[PDB]
Amino acid sequence: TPVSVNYHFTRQCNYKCGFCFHTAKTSFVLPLEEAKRGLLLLKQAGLEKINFSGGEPFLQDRGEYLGKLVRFCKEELALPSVSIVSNGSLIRERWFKDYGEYLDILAISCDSFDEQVNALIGRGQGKKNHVENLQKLRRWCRDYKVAFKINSVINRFNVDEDMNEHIKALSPVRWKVFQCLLIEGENSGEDALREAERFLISNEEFETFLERHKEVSCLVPESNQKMKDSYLILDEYMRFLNCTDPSKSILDVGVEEAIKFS
Numbered sequence: 001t002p003v004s005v006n007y008h009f010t011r012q013c014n015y016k017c018g019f020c021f022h023t024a025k026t027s028f029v030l031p032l033e034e035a036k037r038g039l040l041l042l043k044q045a046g047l048e049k050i051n052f053s054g055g056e057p058f059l060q061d062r063g064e065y066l067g068k069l070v071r072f073c074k075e076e077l078a079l080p081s082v083s084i085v086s087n088g089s090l091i092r093e094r095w096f097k098d099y100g101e102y103l104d105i106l107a108i109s110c111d112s113f114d115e116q117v118n119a120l121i122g123r124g125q126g127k128k129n130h131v132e133n134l135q136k137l138r139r140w141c142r143d144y145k146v147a148f149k150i151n152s153v154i155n156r157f158n159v160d161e162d163m164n165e166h167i168k169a170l171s172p173v174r175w176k177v178f179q180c181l182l183i184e185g186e187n188s189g190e191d192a193l194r195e196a197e198r199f200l201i202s203n204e205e206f207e208t209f210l211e212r213h214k215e216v217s218c219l220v221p222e223s224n225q226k227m228k229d230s231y232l233i234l235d236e237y238m239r240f241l242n243c244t245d246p247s248k249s250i251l252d253v254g255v256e257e258a259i260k261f262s
Ligand SMILES: Nc1ncnc2c1ncn2[C@@H]1O[C@H](CSCC[C@H](N)C(=O)O)[C@@H](O)[C@H]1O
Pocket: 013, 019, 020, 021, 022, 053, 054, 055, 056, 057, 085, 086, 087, 088, 107, 108, 109, 151, 152, 153, 178, 179, 180, 181, 182, 187, 196
């Protein structure tokens, strides 16, 4: 019986972020009507806020899959808060025309305003305009009446960056600032798809970054401890996972039984 949920419905992505903590282990995505069934179960178990993530949410079916679930959550389930977290690179303006009215919040991952740092940490596909893309997406959120947030992973390569003026110029509703998180089997392990150890920062370095940006009123910190205690993952099979063997899928045992495992 949860209030908010992070639904990582896909693990496919077009970027290669070196620290990615939710890696391309599978290509499975549920049939649309199976996801719709699980989302309804969550609604009936008392869900109020849903956040679509991955993976890159806009990759599947050029965003139409995501748009259909977004519309189902707002129209059919009457969820008062529907959000997406995206790297932003595959978002088409046409998506906003077709689905934007159902979307409350679009959070775009941007870890640096230094386009060298962004290419280095893997946040791109080659064009090295990932930050110029950000102002276009900000403008689309303004024009299509979607709240715009920025997600940043604080890591070895941006820990001393001063982002104050850049974040202020974008005027996001929120700037969610995550300490780089290690998850064994995801970005840690000899067989893992990423090895994030070299990206990690200490709690002291993280706190120093927050203090440097204390003038940014919309800043919301997400330390390692906060993520481990409060960030709940519903994976691409609609099994529950935490950030510290997955549960049974809610599609098989229900929300109550599945939440007990995690
Ligand atoms: N090692 C790590 N520690 C903390 N946050 C991480 C992380 N790896 C990824 N994230 C963040 O988790 C969120 C979901 S990742 C999937 C959403 C989308 N592909 C995107 O990049 O925006 C993103 O903000 C991402 O940058």
